[PDB]
Amino acid sequence: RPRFSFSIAAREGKARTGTIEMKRGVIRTPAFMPVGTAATVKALKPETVRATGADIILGNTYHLMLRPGAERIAKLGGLHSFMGWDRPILTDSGGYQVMSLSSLTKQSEEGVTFKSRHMLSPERSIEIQHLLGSDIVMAFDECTPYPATPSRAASSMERSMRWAKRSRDAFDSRKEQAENAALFGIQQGSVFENLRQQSADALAEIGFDGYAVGGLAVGEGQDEMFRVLDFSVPMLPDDKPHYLMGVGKPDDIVGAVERGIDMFDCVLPTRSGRNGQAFTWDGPINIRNARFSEDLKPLDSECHCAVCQKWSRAYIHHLIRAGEILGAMLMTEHNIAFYQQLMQKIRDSISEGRFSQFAQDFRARYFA
Amino acid sequence: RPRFSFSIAAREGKARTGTIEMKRGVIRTPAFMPVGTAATVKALKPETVRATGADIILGNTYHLMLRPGAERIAKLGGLHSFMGWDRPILTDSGGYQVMSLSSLTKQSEEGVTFKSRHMLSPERSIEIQHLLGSDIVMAFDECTPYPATPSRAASSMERSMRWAKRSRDAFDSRKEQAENAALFGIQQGSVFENLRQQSADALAEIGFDGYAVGGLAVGEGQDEMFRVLDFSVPMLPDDKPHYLMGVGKPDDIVGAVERGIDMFDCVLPTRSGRNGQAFTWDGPINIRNARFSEDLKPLDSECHCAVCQKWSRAYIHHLIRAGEILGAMLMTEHNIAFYQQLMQKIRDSISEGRFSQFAQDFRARYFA
Ligand SMILES: Nc1nc(=O)c2cc3nc(NCCN4CCCCC4)[nH]c3cc2[nH]1
Ligand SMILES: Nc1nc(=O)c2cc3nc(NCCN4CCCCC4)[nH]c3cc2[nH]1
Ligand SMILES: [Cl-]
Ligand SMILES: [Cl-]
Ligand SMILES: [Zn+2]
Ligand SMILES: [Zn+2]
């Protein structure tokens, strides 16, 4: 198996479908990555994550470096062995989470020091991801807060680009990592076209295996996110994967694919599952609602998941009302399966040249 | 398949091993029943409960009548369909739980009224268990508090015996229930030999499919519980199953089998699993302890369960420390599997006439 090979099998407008081949497996694109921040996709065994159709999951440098620790995970045989997931794992670099979750931060050209006292930098981030045994390593960046003035966005993006080069160099210096893993760069520039262009130029000059659109899904809303994607995605190399970080709701995913995105991750299906929200083709439902107390239908009428084959809305309603762990388990498995089925329909429709019609049909029903 | 047929295949001293055949499946005895109070064995899919080796699970009249409701479960197709467990279910009658969990109770010859305002009586308890579709129905009784004076124990036991007859009559009046389910009586009498005898006599005169030893595991401790079992179990009909309610720790189970008990239920493996206690052949361990943070061994070195085949102590330690649902799932599956393996070893050793040696070996190692 190759270290990293991206093939585009079909296109429709800006949308693409294909595969990334890696040593630990094949990733079908457009891809959705379930989030496994604490070395677990919450409430699911890895075998169940795979059963839903997931090809790859997301982990986090920031969380794992704090608990259980990067050196510790390496001593225990690496993240794959530790959590029992043998397929590809993409790890975020800490760039976002250090600023989102830390009680106090000190930012400088060297990197970021923070209180959980720890340090992250391009070099340390890449080293941690090496110790974890990540398959797709993210460059260490800064997710510019929204909104930002053009000047603040510019200085932030420029620092990220210097950090991108340091990330590239650190990754390339570690022979085993360079041989077995892939490195993605992260575009910044807030909502500004000229900065997005400068960022894309800088990343392409360095050269990466894939390119993430960073700095979005940070409160700007779908209209603005789509506006920025409209000009930002075409700036990235066409022949490499495009990864939209932290997106999103089903309609966000469809629109982002229409704009050239190949990869997604989001806590929504897992988190909202635990909170009682189930995704269906007719839009989300809250299973806690009294209207479901005697509803014998599955969560979704078409869904092929094991939950929908076996249990009723009424039962899951009871479980979630009761605070039962099995409620969280079943809701989560269903939601992750729903997300994977969405990605499968997207892939199939692009392959068949009917993605535009799929997007239209999807929205008409989902938002009816 | 028969409604109810108990066969004893082998004996050693007071210990027996055999099978109960019922319409929904065979129960190997001595049997351990995982507890499923809220219509779920906490943190496990029914398929996982079955995978551990369980033949039958326990449900509760008291909890289910309050949430989601007995009529509601019947409208939804019965408890088996509702929760997705198609094998036998034994339901406790509410006799214990109404007094243990209710905020206020009023006790009379008719039954018990309580605040969650509801009513339980022999007739209502049997009706609820009918609506649930229970396979083994428990008589509605009173679990005498411990300690009790001989006179208080006597009056309590006598009321339970009158309630046992009312339970028998209510069950027999419902043709579908009498055709498809079994009814067990519950012996009371606290710690007093003469009262236990009077209770056994009363139950045998009425006639039941099985006989539970009630009124124990209520704070008396193992020495006293065993002392009472020594004289109480031989009073019950030899040719019917003997069920010790609410027991217990592994050593309690072994000693109770040595005293003629065929059936057990306890929340210990599930509850203590969630709390970080794992059962092993060398005694329980608390997986949260720092000593496990880098321990690559499975929870137990011999255990055949899926958890022990795949994950380390170190990983489970991390999960439980982090409050992750998967931690609860894995600990629970392992503990329930451990309990089932204990029952299998008990069954095999009695079958082979080496149970005494097994009990000795078990204790020497478990308590080393
Ligand atoms: N290294 C790095 N750089 C980014 O610019 C970035 C940008 C991101 N934007 C998000 N948004 C997450 C949105 N999420 C939606 C569901 C509820 C929780 C928040 N996650 C991100 C992660 C990111 N990681
Ligand atoms: N109907 C009925 N009658 C009883 O005499 C009875 C006696 C019981 N004794 C227990 N003890 C439960 C012990 N358990 C150990 C693990 C922690 C929680 C308490 N459960 C019982 C249930 C019972 N149910
Ligand atoms: Cl997210
Ligand atoms: Cl118990
Ligand atoms: Zn489903
Ligand atoms: Zn095990």
> Phi, psi (5° rounding) for residue B92?
-65, 155
Which atom of ligand 1 approaches the CA of A138 most closely? 1
One-letter amino acid for residue B256 of the chain: A
Q: Within an 8 Å CB–CB cutoff, is residue A50 touching chain B?
A: no
Cα distance between the two ends of chain B: 45
Residue B4 contacts residue B12 (beta carbons within 8 Å):
no
Elucidation method: X-ray
Q: How far is CA A294 from CA A178, A313, A323, in A?
A: 56, 8, 18
Tell me which ligand sits closest to the C-alpha of residue B338. 6
Residue A124, CA atoms < 13 Å, CB-side half-sphere? 15
Q: How far is CA B328 from CA A161, B35, B316, B319, B320, in A?
A: 43, 15, 9, 8, 7
State the Cα angle at B233 between B228 and B239, rounded to 5°: 175
Q: Within an 8 Å CB–CB cutoff, is residue A329 touching chain B?
A: yes
Site of tokens 């053009």: A150
Distance CA B271, CA B46 (A): 17
Q: What is the CATH topology of the domain spanning B1-368?
A: TIM Barrel (3.20.20)
Site of tokens 């960073």: A214
Catalytic member of A252, A262, A265, A300: A265
Distance CA B161, CA B209 (A): 16
Residue A41, CA atoms < 13 Å, CB-side half-sphere? 33
Residue B195 contacts residue B188 (beta carbons within 8 Å):
yes
Distance CA B338, CA B302 (A): 10
Residue A8 contacts residue A16 (beta carbons within 8 Å):
yes
One-letter amino acid for residue B228 of the chain: V
Active site residue A172: no
Cα B321 vs. chain centroid, distance in angstroms? Answer: 30
State the Cα angle at B244 between B243 and B250, rounded to 5°: 120
Neighbours of A204 (CB within 10 A): 16
B309: nearest CA partner in chain A: A84
Distance CA A29, CA A351 (A): 11
Residue A264 contacts residue A33 (beta carbons within 8 Å):
yes
Which atom of ligand 2 approaches the CA of B139 most closely? 1
Long-range contacts, B143-146 (Cβ 8 Å, 24+)? B143/B95, B143/B96, B143/B99, B143/B188, B143/B214, B143/B215, B143/B218, B144/B188, B144/B189, B144/B190, B144/B215, B145/B218, B146/B190, B146/B191, B146/B215, B146/B218, B146/B219, B146/B220
Active site residue A300: no
Catalytic member of B55, B92, B135, B209: B92
Closest partner CB to A40 (pick from B83, B293, B324): B324
CA distance A40 to chain B (A): 7
Q: How far is CA B143 from CA A364, B192, B213, in A?
A: 60, 14, 10
Long-range contacts, B283-292 (Cβ 8 Å, 24+)? B283/B366, B283/B367, B283/B368, B287/B313, B287/B316, B287/B317, B287/B320, B287/B331, B288/B317, B288/B320, B288/B321, B289/B317, B292/B316, B292/B317
3-state secondary structure of B335: helix
Q: Within an 8 Å CB–CB cutoff, is residue A326 touching chain B?
A: yes
CA distance A83 to chain B (A): 7
- Number of residue pairs across A and B with CB atoms under 8 Å? 86
Residue A45 contacts residue A334 (beta carbons within 8 Å):
no
The strand ranges marked E within B144-300 are 182-187, 210-213, 242-244, 263-265, 277-278, 285-286
3-state secondary structure of A137: strand
Strand partners, B187: B213
Distance CA A169, CA B112 (A): 76
Residue A15 contacts residue A7 (beta carbons within 8 Å):
no
> Of all helices (H) and strands (E), which one includes residue B65?
helix B61-66
One-letter amino acid for residue B255 of the chain: G
> Phi, psi (5° rounding) for residue B193?
-60, -45
Q: Is A125 exposed, middle or buried (0-12, 13-18, 19+ CB in 10 A)?
A: buried
Catalytic member of B135, B252, B262, B265: B265
**What is the DSSP pairing of strand A15-22 with strand A263-265?**
unpaired
Name, in order, each residue with C-beta under 8 angstroms of A154's C-beta and a sequence gap of 6 or more: A189, A192, A195
Rounded to 10 deg, the angle between the A325-351 and A355-366 helix axes is: 140
Residue B209, annotated ligand binder?
no
**What is the DSSP pairing of strand A31-33 with strand A57-60?**
unpaired
Residue B95, annotated ligand binder?
yes
Strand partners, B60: B92
**Resolution, rounded to a tenth of an Å?**
1.4
- Closest Cα to atom 11, ligand 1: which residue? A246
Report the b/e string of A37-65 with b at 16+ CB within 10 A.
bbbbbbbbbbebbbbbbbbbbbbbbbbbb
Interruptions in chain B after residues (C–N over 2.5 Å): 116
Strand partners, A265: A33
Residue B256 contacts residue B247 (beta carbons within 8 Å):
yes
Nearest to B275 by CA among B263, B264, B290, B286: B286
3-state helix, strand, coil in chain A (%, to 5): 45, 20, 35
Which atom of ligand 2 approaches the CA of B267 most closely? 16
- Closest Cα to atom 2, ligand 1: which residue? A96
Distance CA A208, CA A267 (A): 26
Q: How far is CA B266 from CA B35, B59, B247, B272, in A?
A: 6, 11, 5, 11
**What is the DSSP pairing of strand B210-213 with strand B112-115?**
unpaired
Residue A319, CA atoms < 13 Å, CB-side half-sphere? 31
